[PDB]
Amino acid sequence: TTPGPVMLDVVGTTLSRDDARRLAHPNTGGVILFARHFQNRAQLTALTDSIRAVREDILIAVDHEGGRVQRFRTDGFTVLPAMRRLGELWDRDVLLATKVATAVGYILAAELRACGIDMSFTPVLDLDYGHSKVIGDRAFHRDPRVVTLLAKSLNHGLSLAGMANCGKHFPGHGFAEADSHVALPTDDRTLDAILEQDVAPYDWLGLSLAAVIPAHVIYTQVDKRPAGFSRVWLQDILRGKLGFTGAIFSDDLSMEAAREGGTLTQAADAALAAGCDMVLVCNQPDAAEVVLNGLKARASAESVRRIKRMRARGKALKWDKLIAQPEYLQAQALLSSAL
Numbered sequence: 638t639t640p641g642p643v644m645l646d647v648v649g650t651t652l653s654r655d656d657a658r659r660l661a662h663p664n665t666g667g668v669i670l671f672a673r674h675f676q677n678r679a680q681l682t683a684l685t686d687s688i689r690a691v692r693e694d695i696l697i698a699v700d701h702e703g704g705r706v707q708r709f710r711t712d713g714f715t716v717l718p719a720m721r722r723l724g725e726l727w728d729r730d731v732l733l734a735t736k737v738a739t740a741v742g743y744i745l746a747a748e749l750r751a752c753g754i755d756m757s758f759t760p761v762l763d764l765d766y767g768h769s770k771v772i773g774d775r776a777f778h779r780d781p782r783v784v785t786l787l788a789k790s791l792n793h794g795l796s797l798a799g800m801a802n803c804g805k806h807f808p809g810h811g812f813a814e815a816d817s818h819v820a821l822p823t824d825d826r827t828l829d830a831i832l833e834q835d836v837a838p839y840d841w842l843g844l845s846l847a848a849v850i851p852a853h854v855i856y857t858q859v860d861k862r863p864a865g866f867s868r869v870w871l872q873d874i875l876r877g878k879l880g881f882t883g884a885i886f887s888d889d890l891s892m893e894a895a896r897e898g899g900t901l902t903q904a905a906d907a908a909l910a911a912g913c914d915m916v917l918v919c920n921q922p923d924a925a926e927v928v929l930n931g932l933k934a935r936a937s938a939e940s941v942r943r944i945k946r947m948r949a950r951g952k953a954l955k956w957d958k959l960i961a962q963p964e965y966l967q968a969q970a971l972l973s974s975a976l
């Protein structure tokens with residue numbers, strides 16, 4: 638089988654029949670995991686094994702950014718710094734910050750792969766304007782050039798463990814005031830101002846950028862539709878102007894900002910019509926199931942190529958080997974000392 642366009646979640650720490658029904662649905666492409674899905678490493682590994690036993694082509698992801706966004710923080714998962722801490726380190730020693738960024742990405746990726754997870758929805762490329770509380774310390778730095786090179790260094794670390802990446806929230810959640818979880822944010826700048834600064838890391842990363850999540854933010858001088866529902870942002874700018882060929886994942890359609898798109902099924906249709914390859918529907922698996930069964934038909938072949946490319950590459954070390962690996966051990970020591 639081949640992956641569908643919907644990324645949803647499972648009900649708990651072990652798979653239920655309802656989960657297995659949803660996982661088997663042709664429109665399912667992925668699972669996103671949250672803190673409630675984690676008791677310990679052994680339980681998590683068994684959960685991801687069982688998910689792949691139902692659907693072998695499934696993508697498994699998690700939000701592991703560090704700082705305030707890190708779902709697994711116990712039983713041996715390394716608590717990672719907020720990305721803002723890396724920008725602060727850069728302001729003292731640029732080269733060391735890049736070295737530390739790579740170590741963070743390697744630890745991050747290697748620990749997740751040891752538990753059977755394909756990817757993390759990282760890095761945040763939002764610029765640290767200071768305007769956005771929802772982003773806040775999740776942003777690397779104010780300067781798009783600095784964001785770019787730190788994110789690139791992080792992504793390199795991810796790649797060393799065979800893990801891809803996902804830049805977010807395109808074209809930038811950093812300038813807008815409001816929190817898209819609970820309201821619909823706006824950004825009234827010109828297209829050109831947005832392109833010159835907030836979009837610049839997406840453009841400069843080139844092949845070091847594997848995927849994008851777009852913001853549920855309305856950029857009122859560019860398009861009346863939030864970015865994740867906007868063909869202007871997703872096709873004209875991202876695919877067109879930037880020539881990006883990686884996967885586009887919608888931000889979570891359960892977020893309040895996304896009700897600007899309609900019922901869940903209507904919003905999903907709109908995100909995919911706009912240019913998302915996958916849509917996230919989090920924290921309401923039965924509503925996700927209505928989406929799975931109601932989605933309007935579309936061409937998906939181009940999307941499927943991109944989705945398959947998000948699967949982790951090559952073999953991962955299990956925990957019992959990772960814990961003795963000098964590279965892993967070295968990275969741990971560097972993170973400890975440098976911050």
Ligand SMILES: CC(=O)N[C@H]1CNC[C@H](O)[C@@H](O)[C@@H]1O
Nearest residue numbers: 700758771805806817888889
């Ligand atoms: C704007 C914002 O913080 N969105 C987050 C929440 N929605 C879906 C995922 O959990 C995560 O990757 C997103 O970054």
